[PDB]
Design a protein around this nucleic acid. Structure first.
Ligand SMILES: [Mg+2]
Ligand SMILES: [Mg+2]
Ligand SMILES: [Mg+2]
Ligand SMILES: [Mg+2]
Ligand SMILES: [Mg+2]
Ligand SMILES: [Mg+2]
Ligand SMILES: [Mg+2]
Ligand SMILES: [Mg+2]
Ligand SMILES: [Mg+2]
Lengths: 92, 285, 47, 119
RNA sequence: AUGAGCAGGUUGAAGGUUGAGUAACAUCAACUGGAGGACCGAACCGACUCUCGUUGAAACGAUAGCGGAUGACUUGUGAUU
RNA sequence: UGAGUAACGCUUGGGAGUGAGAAUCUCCCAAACCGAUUGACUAAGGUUUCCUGGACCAGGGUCGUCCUUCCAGGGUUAGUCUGGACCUAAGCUGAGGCUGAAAAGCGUAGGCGAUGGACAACAGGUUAAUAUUCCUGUACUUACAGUUAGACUGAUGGAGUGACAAAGAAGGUUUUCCACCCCCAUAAUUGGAUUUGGGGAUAAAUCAUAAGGUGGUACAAUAGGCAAAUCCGUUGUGCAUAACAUUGAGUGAUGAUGUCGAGUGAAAGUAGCGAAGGUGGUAUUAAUCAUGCUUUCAAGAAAAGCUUCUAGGGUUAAUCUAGCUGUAACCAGUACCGAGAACGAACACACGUAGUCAAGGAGAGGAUCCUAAGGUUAGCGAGUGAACUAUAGCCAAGGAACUCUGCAAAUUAACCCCGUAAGUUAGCGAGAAGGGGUGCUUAUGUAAAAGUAAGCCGCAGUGAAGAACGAGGGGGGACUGUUUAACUAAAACACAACUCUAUGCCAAACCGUAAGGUGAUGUAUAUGGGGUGACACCUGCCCAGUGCUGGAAGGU
């Protein structure tokens, strides 16, 4: 409920391609230590719409900046898609 | 009795033999009763440290220990009845599945002669002498074949329970207690008169006449190759080394370790049981 | 031919892992030595 | 060295000749190495001179050499040949193709040449 | 400890049944049965020979042959000395 | 310096296009190899190597507009898949404790530990990248609350089941297959065609059916199952031949007015459109029933789980079963490669790496040759065709004269048919040796085919590809096996068997200081150790010396 489990929404062409359907599957990146029940409860508290389904995945850190004399590591983040009832939509 | 196996597999010749298992057993199908089976974990010659303490022991098949009642204590003056005679992989002899009147199944070591439907009893009062009966040695008359003897009273039949073994009664001692026994292999001992036993020789008398033909059969039986000393190197064995088929060098043959081996007495004389011995397969004490 | 390093991350973790090196006194001693040398990859637990 | 490429076996040589002459019939010009055009020209001339009769036997003989191309399949290439290429050469005794030399390639300095046929 | 694998095709034991035979045995003939650290031979395992290679393709290999190939077999995973 | 020398570590040709630059990039057409695999799905392993756009410093044994390289952006979606929240095997760890200068070692209750057990989801579609996860269609499972009907519920404990070896054979069942039929396109300039080519399908799930398989059955007594049991076990009685219980491949219907579908095809072979989507047999094929059955001995996991039993509870009720309404279903993996370029080999290294799918022709076959589905252009080329090297092909006459030796190479080779000696442990020798036939057509063959007859052709008829060369005598080891990874595979080691020796259980021997453990949950028909090494016949003399055992007087 602290709403420290909704870090950011991501807007990619795949996300839009899913948006021009009818379920309007909104997606977010969430606190990796959180869970699907916490994510859906937070979504209910922040918008007021009870979600239909939640699916999650996490992107493992990888080598970034290649060979540049100072290579680093990427960010480990969890993405949580949030389906909705067919006849509803909301902004972000 | 043994049944000769004719291989006719044209790669060498082997005159192997095997106990008949057909006219001696009953219900030759391997269908043991469930309630008294516990699996044996094959130590494989090794030890809790994981090292090898006993050489050439490993590779046996997977067995299931048949819980055998040696003590014969919880059931007294309650009649039983032999149900079948199976082949027990763990030991050389044959096991009978008996059934007491109350309805508690158990395994005992089958004396030779018994068949399905016979009736046996075990108690502490003077009873009959038919094979399978059990009673303290103080009541058994002299001369009868006896097995499943134990050293300490209420201890369970450690002594003389192998296939085709027995022991002859030889009366009592002059002290009144310590009834004298003529154990197999010449040794004569003294047993307390309150020790239990069972009359009748042990069945499967022809386990000695078997002739294992193939090496693989022996290996499946749990035995591994034994490398002689003369094949060894001068390290790892006192008989090793030598530039080809050397004879034993030292004064006397040696063990893999330095201990003297041939013809050397090794029993510990300072055991309380020494007073119980009359002859030790060669001579007095 | 079959070389001498067939990888299996489970075996690596159970053998050289941190908790494996925290099981015996000698493991604690070698951990102390590695802290003294300040090695960044202290154990195989860190990639 | 014991194992090696199959190399330029007789079958590979004659199949390359087949492919090149088929391509010449299809298009009319080829940019290939000079010392391959100088060999292909023989079979090219033989096929051109053999096709000035249009009997079924000559078409059967021609079948032994042609290979289908993106522009023309084998049967359509036969029809093209025996219908318009051979009539163009009904009075020239031999020498139906010319092999002129280009500049060397930057890759291998090999001496590319054009195998071309015209009256 | 726990699983897995052995393309295919041969040979036809013991035992049993039937009949003969025997006073009863033994033994003989036909049918059944399908055994073997059995056979031939792919995957698999191994390394007996020649050549090549020896700053090699390779810190032990390649073509060609070669031996075993239902077992004292081969192999994955886990544990231990 | 060696030196612009060896080497560049399994293969092509052409058209068009881009671009400054083209053998090496893109597209197109062929071509050649792989095709029991370079084809497809994955475990482990790697950790972004995946997709799109851009770049060609560096890396690519050459070039580069291009790359598994570099830069920018993007991509993995699970109540049902793999693992955890369930269960234990080997084993690990281990409160107390035992043991040990100290550190520590062993070990009990407990707790972990899959390579195994139990457990609910299928077909299709969709993107550049994911799909039993997303979407459509259809379902299933478990909790939780309420409601309705019925019923007394029964554990942390007991019992049953769970629950298992190897080999082999037969049978049911659809399949493969064949034949017929249906549908679609196809009618051919090179001589003759009145055909040729392709396709003929559907899941989980619910209901009914179900060939079969498994195994006495019901009643009455109970002195056993830490405690009680109606359960199990035990004992009698009648019925027994099928009844009962249990399980069961497949079949039928819905699922499906759907999807797929040969092809047709516009803006791409793509969107779309898309016909038939069957009959009978089978002396062949696989897969299931099957954790079924038979035989043999080397006698073939545990726990959880499921059913049941009472205990204990409930009674002014709980709890369970069934239906209906409603709510919920957690965490981690999900990309890609999976190998002659992403892993282990320092490499874009000819090497190694578990499992699964495994088409056609001849073929017993996954052997062999050419191919189907599908994939590739072995990341230096072009010339010449000298010596010389390697790998092939062949060689007249002779046929081991070579040589340390027939090393190497050469002959035979498949199926069918005659024919097979000495010796022997009577099993073998033995595919012994030595010979004959195979092609095609017609006829006859039977159920197919082998077989048979007639005829024809060639030098040749498993016309190619894949198939044992034997004979005789001797030494050794009885035999199958194992052995010096990376110079020695044998006469060496082991082996079944023989003998001797030790050991009566807290056994001898062994690891450890010791607890403790192996020996062994075994008991002299057993176990440890030395020596010989099937089998057949034998194993002679010497106890002076040494070793061992025994000895009781004396000396030291
Ligand atoms: Mg040069
Ligand atoms: Mg020079
Ligand atoms: Mg030179
Ligand atoms: Mg060179
Ligand atoms: Mg490879
Ligand atoms: Mg593999
Ligand atoms: Mg094939
Ligand atoms: Mg092949
Ligand atoms: Mg010897």
């Amino acid at each position: 409920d602290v709403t420290n489990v909704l870090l950011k929404p991501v807007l990619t062409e795949k996300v839009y391609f899913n948006q021009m359907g009818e379920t309007k599957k909104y997606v977010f990146v969430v606190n990796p230590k959180a869970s699907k029940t916490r994510v859906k409860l937070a979504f209910e508290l922040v918008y007021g719409i009870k979600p239909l389904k939640v699916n999650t995945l996490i992107r493992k850190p990888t080598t970034i900046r290649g060979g540049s004399r100072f290579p680093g590591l990427s960010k480990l983040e969890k993405l949580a898609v949030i389906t909705l009832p067919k006849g509803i939509a909301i902004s972000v | 009795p043994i049944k000769k196996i004719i291989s006719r597999s044209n790669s060498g010749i082997h005159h192997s033999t095997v106990i008949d298992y057909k006219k001696l057993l009953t219900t030759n199908k391997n269908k043991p009763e469930k309630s008294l089976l516990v699996t044996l974990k094959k130590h494989g010659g090794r030890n809790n440290q994981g090292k090898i303490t006993v050489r050439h022991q490993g590779g046996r098949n997977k067995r299931k220990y048949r819980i055998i009642d040696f003590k014969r204590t919880h059931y007294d003056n309650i009649e039983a009845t032999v149900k079948s005679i199976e082949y027990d992989p763990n030991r050389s002899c044959f096991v009978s599945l008996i059934t007491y009147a109350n309805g508690a199944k158990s395994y005992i070591i089958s004396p030779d002669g018994i068949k399905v439907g016979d009736k046996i009893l075990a108690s502490e009062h003077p009873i009959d002498i038919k094979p399978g009966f059990s009673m303290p040695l103080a009541f058994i008359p002299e001369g009868t074949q006896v097995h499943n003897i134990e050293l300490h009273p209420k201890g369970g039949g450690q002594i003389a329970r192998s296939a085709g073994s027995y022991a002859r009664i030889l009366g009592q001692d002059e002290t009144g207690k310590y009834v004298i026994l003529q154990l197999l292999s010449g040794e004569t001992r003294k047993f307390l008169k309150e020790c239990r036993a069972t009359v009748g020789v042990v069945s499967n008398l022809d386990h000695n006449l078997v002739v294992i033909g193939k090496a693989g059969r022996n290996r499946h039986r749990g035995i591994r190759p034994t490398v002689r000393g003369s094949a060894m190197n001068p390290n790892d064995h006192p008989h090793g080394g030598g530039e080809g088929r050397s004879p034993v060098g030292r004064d006397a043959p040696r063990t893999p370790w330095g201990k003297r081996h041939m013809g050397v007495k090794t029993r510990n004389m300072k055991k309380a049981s020494t007073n119980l011995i009359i002859r030790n397969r060669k001579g007095e004490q | 031919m079959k070389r001498t390093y067939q990888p299996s991350k489970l075996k690596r973790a159970k053998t050289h892992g941190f908790l494996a090196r925290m099981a015996t006194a000698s493991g604690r001693k070698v951990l102390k030595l590695r802290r003294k040398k300040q090695r960044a990859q202290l154990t195989v637990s860190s990639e | 060295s014991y194992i090696n490429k199959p190399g330029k076996t007789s079958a590979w040589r004659v199949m390359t000749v087949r492919q090149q002459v088929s391509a010449v019939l299809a298009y009319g010009k080829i940019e290939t190495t000079l010392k391959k055009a100088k060999n292909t020209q023989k079979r090219l001339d033989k096929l051109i001179t053999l096709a000035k009769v249009d009997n079924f036997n000559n078409r059967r003989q021609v079948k032994k050499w042609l290979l289908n191309t993106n522009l023309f399949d084998v049967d359509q290439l036969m029809d093209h040949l025996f219908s318009k290429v051979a009539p163009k050469y009904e009075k020239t005794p031999g020498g139906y193709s010319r092999v002129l030399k280009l500049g060397p390639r930057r890759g291998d300095a090999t001496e590319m040449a054009i195998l071309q046929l015209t009256d």
